[PDB]
Amino acid sequence: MKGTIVGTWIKTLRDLYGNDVVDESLKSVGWEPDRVITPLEDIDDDEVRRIFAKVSEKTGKNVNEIWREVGRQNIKTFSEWFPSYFAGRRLVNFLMMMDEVHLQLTKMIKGATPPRLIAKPVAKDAIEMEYVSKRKMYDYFLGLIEGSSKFFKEEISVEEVERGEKDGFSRLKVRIKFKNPVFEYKKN
Ligand code: HEM
């Protein structure tokens, strides 16, 4: 996982659960007191998994619940640490940009396997977004969408279309419907 993104999770975990939980959890995987992660650094996925496992053990919360709350709260962290991706954008623009953003931010990681997040308009007031990744981080994905709606103050409904796993890739396709129309028909 891209290191500075793991950085946002650590910060979001402190917001949710406190510095003691997080400090103890980072201690258990040997992290310096207290490390600053560089933009080129990759952090091993299994190290992330062990950090979150320690948070689960100390808080008593299931790891999937933690990932969901982290996704919900990490949009705010992103707005602080990566503010250029926000900057007056509308929610639908933000969501439809995510696939390209994740390709850009992992371009110079070796064996980079960013999630794919392709969104396509399906109605004047709706997009379909399909998560595709070997990591199967459904709760984080769904939590980011919910946090995105709160942050942009645009009400959405999220309905699952389908999910699957083939050849190690997990897929989750959701239909995001906006209360207000966000698209118009134009001649192709
Ligand atoms: C400014 C906002 C965001 C930035 C800068 C950002 C960037 C990133 C980066 C660089 C990664 C690591 C990928 C890797 O190392 O392979 C990541 C993880 C992830 N991102 Fe985002 N992201 C943002 C918002 C979102 C949103 C809105 C969604 C979904 C709707 C999303 C879905 C995910 C998921 C599910 C992962 C976990 C990795 C996986 O499942 O394979 N992210 N993010």
Side-chain angles (χ1 to χ4, degrees):
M1 202 79 59
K2 179 172 168 51
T4 59
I5 309 294
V6 178
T8 69
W9 298 343
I10 300 316
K11 173 50 186 310
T12 297
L13 289 166
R14 292 175 189 287
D15 296 345
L16 290 157
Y17 308 119
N19 298 311
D20 285 352
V21 164
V22 167
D23 286 350
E24 295 173 31
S25 296
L26 301 178
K27 187 150 145 177
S28 83
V29 300
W31 273 35
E32 307 88 306
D34 223 292
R35 167 184 204 179
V36 179
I37 310 161
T38 78
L40 275 83
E41 198 158 359
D42 183 72
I43 287 145
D44 195 317
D45 284 356
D46 182 66
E47 196 163 52
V48 177
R49 182 162 23 249
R50 286 153 44 217
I51 295 173
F52 277 66
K54 211 53 170 163
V55 175
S56 177
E57 159 184 342
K58 295 174 182 293
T59 63
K61 301 185 169 306
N62 157 91
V63 179
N64 287 346
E65 175 185 341
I66 294 166
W67 273 115
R68 189 64 161 266
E69 278 306 305
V70 167
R72 288 176 178 152
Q73 303 296 300
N74 210 38
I75 295 301
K76 181 213 153 205
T77 305
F78 279 139
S79 76
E80 294 164 3
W81 289 32
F82 299 87
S84 75
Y85 299 97
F86 295 81
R89 281 181 181 87
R90 303 273 304 173
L91 174 49
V92 71
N93 296 67
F94 180 77
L95 293 176
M96 293 188 76
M97 195 185 35
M98 284 302 105
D99 188 72
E100 185 185 358
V101 167
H102 287 68
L103 294 175
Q104 292 171 322
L105 293 184
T106 57
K107 213 84 191 41
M108 284 327 299
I109 302 294
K110 199 183 33 69
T113 54
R116 303 299 309 268
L117 306 165
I118 301 154
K120 72 179 166 74
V122 297
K124 273 175 167 178
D125 64 344
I127 60 178
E128 283 180 357
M129 189 174 321
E130 191 186 28
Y131 165 81
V132 185
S133 171
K134 281 202 182 176
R135 299 194 179 100
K136 191 179 180 190
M137 291 172 64
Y138 293 162
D139 276 282
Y140 178 62
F141 174 72
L142 294 179
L144 293 156
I145 294 170
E146 297 153 357
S148 285
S149 168
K150 278 106 208 150
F151 182 88
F152 286 86
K153 296 190 170 62
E154 289 184 54
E155 181 188 359
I156 60 178
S157 64
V158 186
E159 150 177 67
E160 180 167 322
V161 180
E162 58 180 356
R163 69 171 65 190
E165 305 172 38
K166 177 187 294 185
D167 302 322
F169 292 93
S170 291
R171 289 177 176 253
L172 174 62
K173 182 189 290 188
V174 293
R175 193 167 187 274
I176 308 166
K177 174 183 174 184
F178 298 74
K179 214 52 170 300
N180 303 310
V182 299
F183 298 112
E184 294 301 301
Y185 292 100
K186 313 296 298 171
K187 302 184 196 67
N188 65 12

